[PDB]
Structure formats: structure tokens, C-alpha cells
Amino acid sequence: KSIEVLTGLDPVKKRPGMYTNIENPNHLIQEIIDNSVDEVLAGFASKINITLYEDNSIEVADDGRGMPVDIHPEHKMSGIELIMTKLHSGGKFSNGGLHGVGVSVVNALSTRLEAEIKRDGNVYHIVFEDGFKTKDLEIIDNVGKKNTGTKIRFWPNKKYFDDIKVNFKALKNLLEAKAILCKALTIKYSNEIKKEKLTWHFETGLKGYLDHKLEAETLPAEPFIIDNFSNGDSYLDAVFCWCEDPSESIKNSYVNLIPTPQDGTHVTGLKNGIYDAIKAYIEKNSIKITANDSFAQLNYVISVKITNPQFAGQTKEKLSNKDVTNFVATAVKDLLTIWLNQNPDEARQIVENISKVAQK
Numbered sequence: 001k002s003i004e005v006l007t008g009l010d011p012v013k014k015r016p017g018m019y020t021n022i023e024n025p026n027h028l029i030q031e032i033i034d035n036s037v038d039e040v041l042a043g044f045a046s047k048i049n050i051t052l053y054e055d056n057s058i059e060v061a062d063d064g065r066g067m068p069v070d071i072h073p074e075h076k077m078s079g080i081e082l083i084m085t086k087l088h089s090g091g092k093f094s095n096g097g098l099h100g101v102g103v104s105v106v107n108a109l110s111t112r113l114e115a116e117i118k119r120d121g122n123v124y125h126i127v128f129e130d131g132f133k134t135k136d137l138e139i140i141d142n143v144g145k146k147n148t149g150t151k152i153r154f155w156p157n158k159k160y161f162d163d164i165k166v167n168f169k170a171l172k173n174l175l176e177a178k179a180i181l182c183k184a185l186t187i188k189y190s191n192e193i194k195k196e197k198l199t200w201h202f203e204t205g206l207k208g209y210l211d212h213k214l215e216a217e218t219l220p221a222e223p224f225i226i227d228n229f230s231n232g233d234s235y236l237d238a239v240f241c242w243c244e245d246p247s248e249s250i251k252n253s254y255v256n257l258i259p260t261p262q263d264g265t266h267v268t269g270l271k272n273g274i275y276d277a278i279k280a281y282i283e284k285n286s287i288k289i290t291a292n293d294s295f296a297q298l299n300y301v302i303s304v305k306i307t308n309p310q311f312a313g314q315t316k317e318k319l320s321n322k323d324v325t326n327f328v329a330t331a332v333k334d335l336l337t338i339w340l341n342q343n344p345d346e347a348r349q350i351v352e353n354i355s356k357v358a359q360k
């Protein structure tokens, strides 16, 4: 943290398009959910509950530690006020975005935002309007010391959005995706407009996912799974297979359950680790095959969980953390190598297909 920066929310209000997808409030919902997900990945939360109200407001609630309320000695303001009313950034050297900016973006772009925090046996409540605090942080009730979490309700400001109606189908798709990638999590959704409720919880995580999305035949017939590989503090889940029917193609990547549509170091890690294992298997067992060839017919889902994710690109949709490439590549190389060794009939066919890709 060589440079640390704190500003007001005016930049967000001036160019909402640089901080959110303004077609509807779905991206704002994703931002709040990403912050509760960080509690789940830290080990402190297991439940995220989403409510869509008839007044078009959205509420997200978790059972995490509860957003901090302590008065910051310098800024003279509770943690929750500081987090909500200011844009926080920093980095190693001087240089918006759809990720890595913070929940104050949601505050900036809402007419109203309420927060209830359960922490230390206290229920705290605070209110904001248009990104400014309008009701003081106050204790409104007591709870047991172990009854904890954060609940945020917000009313997107029509001034900044094409439509303030939440896109139900896209939200359900996003929730299902997150639940698939995180067996510690149960997500509940209540749509008060449609009168529907869903609950997701995937005990088996990604198992069967590619099978469901693809068939078409794949190699391996059973897509290859990497289950909760870790090196201490970073974690990797993945599934991949080759498919010669490019009718349907799945190539999805995430960091901390956040979709990374511009890929990044985790995807590069996967590509390299795969090429490394294919190259070593060909050599250990026998044209010029490249990483592009071994990657060309691959379908995958790759999900890394890391402590301080960094985003790059103008939209901040690409994971940039440099040490991730290495972490993923070694894991993939080693685990796939073991599988190829145990599965020579399918291994041979995978090699043949790749070598056919390379021949043009």
C-alpha cells in the first residue's frame, strides 16, 4: 500500500458508466454480493440472502462478522460510514472500473441506502441518501453475541440508469454461478414482484456442470476436476475437457467468485499448465504443438480464491495478480499429469486431437 487514496463519490456520479453497467441495477447488486462473498471466502459467512422488493429496491444480507462500526482515528467516522461515503483506492505506483472499486459505488448511485449491522451483541442502523449519511449510526436493538452479519437495502437512482427494473433472469444466472463455485455457501432469493423463491446450494460444486452444458461427447468422457487445490492461502477449483463439437463452448473464469470476462493470470496459468502436461506426456511416451493448440478445443471453468485480488484493464475485468499464473500452472500440470498417467486410452486420444489441431 505505497499510495493510498480517498475521494468523494462525485467521479462515480459524473461517469456512472465507468463504475457500473448502467443498463439496469444488476451490476450494483453484484457489487454488494461480492462484498458478502469476501466474508464467505474469509471463513466467516455461509449465507447470502437477496430480496427484490416491489418498490424496485434490492436487499442483500449475510451472516458475516458485520461491517466494522469503530471510529476511524483519522477520518473521525465509523468504519461503515467511511466505506460507504468515499472511494478508496491505492497501489504501488501511480498509473474507474467494474470491479475492485468498492460498495460506495452502489451508495453513490442510489437515492437511498440503509445498512443494518449485527455485531458485538448490537444491531446498528445507518441511512444514506445519494451517497451522504442522513441518519447517524445508532444501536437500535440487541442480539446474541454470535448473531452477526450485514444487511444492505438500496434504491437505485433512475437518473443514472437506462432501466431501474432488475433483470430477474440475469440475476438468477449469476447467483447459480456463484453457488456452484462455493460449497460453503447457500444463496436464497426472494422476488416479491414475481412471488418466487429460490435456494441454491451445491454440495458437489462443479461436478456434472460441464456434462450438463455440453453433451456432445467430451475427452475425458468425465470432465477433469481440480477440487480445492491450495498452497496455503490461495485456492483453485477447475473443470475442463476437450470437445470437438464447437456448437457450444464454455470458457468461464472467476476470482473470488467474480466473473472475469477479460480473463487474466488464472486463465494464462491454466493454458500454460495444460500445455506443460501435454508436452511432458508426449515426450515421456514417444510435429510442433503449441499452447494455443492444446487450448483450442478446451472447455473449462476456472475459479481461484486469493486474498487481495487485483484487476487490470479499463473495465477492471481481467485478473492481474502476477503470482497466480505460477500457482495455477503448477497445480494444473501436476494434477493433469497424474490423470493422464492413469488414463492412457483417453490420454492418447486427447494427444491425437491436439496434434490434429496443430497440423494446421
Ligand SMILES: CCc1[nH]c2nc(Sc3ccc4c(c3)C(=O)N=C4)nc(N3CC[C@@H](N)C3)c2c1Cl
Residues within 6 Å of the ligand: 032, 033, 035, 036, 038, 039, 060, 061, 062, 064, 065, 066, 067, 068, 083, 103, 150, 151, 152
Ligand atoms: C452486505 C454486503 C457486505 N457485507 C459485509 N461484511 C463485512 S464484515 C467484515 C469485513 C472485514 C473486516 C471485519 C468485518 C472486521 O471485523 N475486520 C475486517 N464487511 C463489509 N465490508 C467491509 C469492507 C468492504 N469489503 C465491505 C461487508 C459488505 Cl459491503
